[PDB]
């Protein structure tokens, strides 16, 4: 056929070692630009004035960081939510000072990862698969959108997006707890049940299937060689795993249908992480965790502290120290 | 930065020794 049909057929080829696809056509350049910029800024970027107060934070290895302390630093509070491409700076020197790399990285990354999601759907279509892997991936993607995009929107500044760094991430979590009491928020409690329960069920299923592997090997070889790739039959006795697990608890707390069991494995963490992503995304609009400060009082009206009041003493320490030079007026309203 | 100068050798042996162990086992595997 003609040129454009050759190109189309290559793009959507199921014979390429890595699938490209139409989503891939956007994903590849945006992920490459994000990765290249991120690697160079992490190693060599000069200090960034994150809070807009002419107090630059050093985030790169060459300016005194290690792997744990380093980061790509969010762009200046002075910028807020304004778009700050390279071409809007008078010079690269200005762009680096005000944190331009952060914007470039997050935008190319949010776009690339969104297309990574679409690319998962796209290949599943070309292979004849059911299509909902990409739904599962939407839980982590939405999480990323929350800390890098939504939360800056609600608060008015990319200076309050999550930093690209190990310690930067901790910084973000601590300040979040003081400003929103996320620990007392049900959606983050749902997220913790999501991931603890994911881990638990992960270990459970691995241990249960591993426990019922069919003897196909000797004791001097890896049990793993009892399974051959593409083999017709199952390599474990699911009836036996149910028999074990049904007795460990009781017969109906246990799954004997493989399809129902694996759907539960998918849904538990995905839902829970949807909820914690929705939790960041709504604390972005200052609907915060439950507040039980001074919620118990005695017959006279003395405050009788609870554990919520002790949490609040901690929150208050975080509140009054963070960004110690950045507040001139007594309420920290964003 | 006033870092621990025994850190370079600790990091280097931390990588080299176990990695060499793996490589030795893998290569003698591929040749039998």
């Amino acid at each position: 056929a003609n040129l454009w049909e050759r190109f189309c057929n290559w793009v959507t080829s199921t014979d390429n070692r890595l699938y490209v696809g139409w989503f891939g056509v956007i994903m590849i350049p945006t992920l490459l630009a994000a990765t290249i910029c991120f690697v160079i800024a992490f190693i060599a970027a000069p200090p960034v004035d994150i809070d807009g107060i002419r107090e630059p934070v050093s985030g790169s290895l060459l300016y005194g960081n290690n792997i744990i302390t380093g980061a790509v630093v969010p762009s200046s509070n002075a910028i807020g939510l304004h778009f700050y491409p390279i071409w809007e700076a008078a010079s690269l020197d200005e762009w680096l000072y005000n944190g331009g790399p952060y914007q470039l990285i997050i935008f190319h990354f949010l776009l690339g990862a969104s297309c990574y999601m679409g690319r998962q759907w796209e290949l599943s279509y070309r292979l004849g698969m059911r299509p909902w892997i990409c739904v599962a991936y939407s839980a982590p993607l939405a999480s990323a959108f929350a800390v890098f995009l939504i939360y800056p929107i609600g608060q008015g500044s990319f200076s309050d997006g999550m930093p690209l760094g190990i310690s930067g991430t901790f910084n973000f979590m601590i300040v979040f707890q003081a400003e929103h009491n996320i620990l007392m928020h049900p959606f983050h409690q749902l997220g913790v049940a999501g991931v603890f329960g994911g881990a638990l069920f992960c270990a459970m299923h691995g241990s249960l299937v591993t426990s019922s592997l069919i003897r196909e090997t000797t004791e001097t070889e890896s049990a793993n060689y009892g399974y051959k790739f593409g083999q017709e039959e199952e390599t474990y006795n699911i009836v036996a795993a149910h028999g074990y697990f049904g007795r460990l608890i009781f017969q109906y707390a246990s799954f004997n249908n493989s399809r129902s069991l694996h759907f539960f494995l998918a849904a538990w963490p995905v839902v829970g992480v949807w909820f914690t992503a929705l939790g960041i995304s709504t604390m972005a609009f200052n609907l915060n965790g439950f507040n039980f400060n001074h919620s118990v009082i005695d017959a006279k009206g003395n405050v009788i502290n609870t554990w919520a009041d002790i949490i609040n003493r901690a929150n208050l320490g975080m509140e009054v120290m963070h960004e110690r030079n950045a507040h001139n007026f007594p309420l920290d309203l964003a | 930065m006033e870092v621990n100068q025994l850190g370079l050798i600790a990091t280097a042996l931390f990588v080299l020794v176990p990695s060499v162990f793996l490589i030795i086992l893998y290569v003698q595997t591929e040749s039998q």
Binding site: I43, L61, L62, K228, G230 | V3, G7, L8, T11, A12
Partner: peptide, 30 residues
Amino acid sequence: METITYVFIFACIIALFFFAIFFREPPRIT
């Protein structure tokens, strides 16, 4: 020296990624 070291290790991982993908044990249907 510390910067060089972190970058070296990161660089080795990226090279590992390349071999683990393109020079993997190919899966076959035994």
